[PDB]
Structure formats: C-alpha cells, structure tokens
Design an enzyme around this catalytic site. Structure first.
Site, short mmCIF file in Angstrom:
data_model
loop_
_atom_site.label_atom_id
_atom_site.label_comp_id
_atom_site.label_asym_id
_atom_site.label_seq_id
_atom_site.Cartn_x
_atom_site.Cartn_y
_atom_site.Cartn_z
CG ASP A 175 -30.07 31.27 0.37
OD1 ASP A 175 -30.73 30.55 1.08
OD2 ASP A 175 -28.89 31.43 1.22
CE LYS A 180 -24.43 24.61 4.93
NZ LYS A 180 -24.89 23.50 4.52
NE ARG A 209 -22.63 32.42 15.46
CZ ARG A 209 -22.91 32.96 15.76
NH1 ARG A 209 -22.37 34.51 15.40
NH2 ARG A 209 -23.91 33.47 15.67
CD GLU A 226 -15.86 32.38 10.10
OE1 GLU A 226 -14.59 33.40 9.65
OE2 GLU A 226 -15.87 31.12 11.11
CB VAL A 227 -21.35 38.54 9.10
CG1 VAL A 227 -21.49 39.60 8.76
CG2 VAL A 227 -21.63 37.49 8.16
C1 LIG Z 1 -26.38 42.10 10.22
C2 LIG Z 1 -25.48 40.81 10.31
C3 LIG Z 1 -26.48 39.68 11.16
C4 LIG Z 1 -25.72 38.62 10.74
O1 LIG Z 1 -26.60 37.72 11.50
O2 LIG Z 1 -25.74 38.07 9.45
C5 LIG Z 1 -25.51 38.81 8.13
C6 LIG Z 1 -25.31 38.85 7.08
C7 LIG Z 1 -25.08 39.32 5.80
C8 LIG Z 1 -24.46 39.45 4.85
N1 LIG Z 1 -24.35 38.25 4.19
O3 LIG Z 1 -24.66 37.74 3.28
O4 LIG Z 1 -24.39 36.78 5.65
C9 LIG Z 1 -24.41 40.08 4.06
O5 LIG Z 1 -23.99 39.94 2.52
C10 LIG Z 1 -24.62 41.22 3.90
C11 LIG Z 1 -25.09 42.25 5.31
C12 LIG Z 1 -24.76 41.02 6.35
C13 LIG Z 1 -25.64 41.05 8.07
C14 LIG Z 1 -25.30 40.74 9.17
#
Ligand SMILES: Cc1cc(=O)oc2cc3c([N+](=O)[O-])c(O)ccc3cc12
Length: 327
Positions: free
Chosen positions: A150, A43, A41, A46-47
């Site tokens: 970032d 701002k 999650r 959501e993932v």
């Molecule tokens: C696996 C995973 C866990 C998590 O908490 O946050 C993520 C964020 C991701 C993001 N993101 O932009 O936040 C990605 O662009 C790709 C993969 C991602 C994978 C996770």
C-alpha cells in the site's frame, strides 16, 4: 513465478514467525492514553494525537473501524516482527474499549505535513534523500519476508523539520511464500501495478517497486497522481498509453495471460511514449537523466525485470546520499 531474492526467508524461519492467526494479543491499560485531537481519517481507521498519562508523553492513537479479526492480527504480527528496523513506525502498546471492545494501536509519536502542501516545496536533493530512506524500509521488510502492498504518499510520514521519514499503515501488508497466490484488491488505484490489473496473483516483493515508481514519477513530474484512472480498466489504459502495447503483449505472452474482450478492446494499440516527453516548465527543475534511468528500471511490465530494493539503493542516482551516510 517466484521472487529472485529472499525467496527462502520464511522457509528457513520458525512457523511462529510467519503464522499470525495463532497470535494471542496481550492488551494494556486503555486509560493510560488520552485523545487530544484528530489528525487523520480512513475507511479502516481514525487517527488522533494523544497523551500518555503515565509519563506525559505524546503518542499516536489509531482507533480501528469494525473489521475482521484476522486482518487485525496480521497487522499486529507484522508490526512486531518489523519493530526496530530502519524507518519503520513503532508499535508501543495495544488497547481496547471495555464496553464496545474497539481496539486502538498506540505508536511512537510521528509528525507530518500533508503531502499536497509539502511536495510542491521539495528540492531535487530532498527527493533523493526521502526516496532513499523509503528504500531502506522496503529492503528491510522484504529481507524479513514481508510485502507492504500500500505504498503511496499518504502512507509515508515526513517530519520535514527533523528530516525523519516513517512508513506507516501496515494494514494491507503480507508475508511472502514462493508460489503462493495473493489477493489483487490491494493498494490505491493510482499505485496498482500491471500484475494487479491483469489478475496475475502470484506476485512478490516487486509489487512494492512498481508503486514506488508511480510515487516517484508524480514527484519528479509534478503530476499527482501520475497515472490517473477513474476505474481499474481506465487505469490500465492510462498505463498502456505511456509504456506502449508491444511490451504489454510480450508480457502477456510470457506469463500466458489473456485479457478479456472489454479491456483488450479498450487498451487498443499504442507506441511507447518516451519519458522525456513528460518534462515541462513546471517540473523541469526535477527531471534528470539519472532520475530517468532509475524510473525506467522501476516501471517495467515484467515484475521479474524490475530492480530489487537492494539493487535500487546501489543505483548511481543515490550516489551522493550514500556518500553522506558513509561519514
Ligand atoms: C501523523 C498522521 C497523520 C495522518 O493523517 O495519518 C496518520 C496515520 C498513521 C497510521 N495509519 O495507519 O494510518 C499509522 O499506522 C501510524 C501513524 C499514523 C500517523 C498519521
């Protein structure tokens, strides 16, 4: 001020390559993809862990929160230009809701363990390994004319079982052009370099190296975050109490910057605190003189004095990681 390396990358490349606003997205089948469980999650998004119904393959479904179109094209153009490079997350498809038209980026599946639970368990060597891997991503992107902006632990995904790292969340990255003036409201407070804290807008690739240095210091000292400010002003104070104010004044006079009365009065006067003073019983197994020499060369007020990603990978701190690769 201008980058000391890769200054002309975008200069020598077709406009199409760096011009992301003129991008026109090619969408895919939303129903190819199904959500199985939330994993993150933010701002901006959501993932979710998802499934590809075509080939029954696991994937990453990132559902974006309502935001300006330019920001969303920028991230997409950057992901495309970087696709395939060492240790960078892979964009697989792009889809959106018909009715509300919220988009979703589909990625190669990535496994991760929360860093708050993972970092306490990392060894001396693990830290060299994972930092080196991260540096390979950073040098790649810089060599392709891009700044990430970032860098922080929540943006580095680590599947520790497979010892695989992926730099993620390219939502704040940008292209670099000599002389250009950038926005300073990038990155998490704890990882902001001094340029972002004194309003120096013509920064370059070296911004990422400061953030890297903060991440590294937290890891070797087991104090996360390392510079812990309640607001931006507090952040610069926290830094000045470590590096000292003499270096700060030298830095400010060279680029001819002047801090406003509030901040200046707060910063006050402080002599440098030697890196060694940060060692204690909790982190003694991580702190070495090479790590110190590395760190010292990263955390420098003057972005122009800081090691590049490429010089950084050739530091003797990583000499064993390199030798393991040459075989
Ligand atoms: C696996 C995973 C866990 C998590 O908490 O946050 C993520 C964020 C991701 C993001 N993101 O932009 O936040 C990605 O662009 C790709 C993969 C991602 C994978 C996770």
């Amino acid at each position: 001020s201008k980058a000391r390396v890769y200054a002309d990358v975008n200069v020598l490349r077709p406009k199409e390559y760096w011009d992301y606003e003129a991008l026109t997205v090619q969408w895919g089948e939303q129903d190819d993809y199904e959500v199985v469980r939330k994993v993150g999650r933010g701002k901006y998004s959501e993932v979710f862990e998802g499934i590809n119904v075509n080939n029954n393959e696991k994937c990453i479904i990132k559902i974006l929160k309502p935001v300006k179109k330019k920001k969303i094209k920028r991230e997409i153009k950057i992901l495309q230009n970087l696709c395939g490079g060492p240790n960078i997350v892979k964009l697989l498809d792009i889809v959106r809701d018909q009715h509300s038209k919220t988009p979703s980026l589909i990625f190669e599946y990535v496994n991760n363990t929360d860093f708050k639970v993972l970092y306490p368990t990392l060894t001396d060597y693990d830290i060299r390994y994972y930092i080196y891997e991260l540096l390979k991503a950073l040098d790649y992107c810089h060599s392709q004319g891009i700044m990430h902006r970032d860098v922080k632990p929540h943006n580095v995904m680590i599947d520790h079982e497979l010892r695989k790292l992926r730099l993620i969340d390219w939502g704040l990255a940008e292209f670099y052009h000599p002389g250009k003036e950038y926005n300073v409201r990038v990155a998490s407070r704890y990882f902001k370099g001094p340029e972002l804290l004194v309003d120096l807008q013509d920064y370059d690739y070296s911004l990422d190296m400061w953030s890297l240095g903060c991440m590294f210091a937290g890891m070797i000292f087991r104090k996360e975050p390392f510079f812990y400010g309640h607001d931006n002003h507090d952040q610069l104070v926290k830094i000045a109490k470590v590096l000292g104010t003499d270096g700060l004044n030298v830095y400010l006079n060279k680029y001819r910057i002047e801090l406003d009365p509030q901040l200046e009065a707060l910063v006050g006067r402080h002599s440098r605190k030697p890196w060694l003073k940060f060692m204690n019983a909790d982190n003694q197994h991580l702190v070495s003189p090479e790590a110190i020499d590395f760190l010292d060369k990263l955390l420098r007020y003057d972005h122009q004095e800081r090691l590049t990603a490429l010089e950084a990978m050739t530091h003797p701190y990583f000499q064993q990681v390199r030798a393991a690769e040459n075989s």
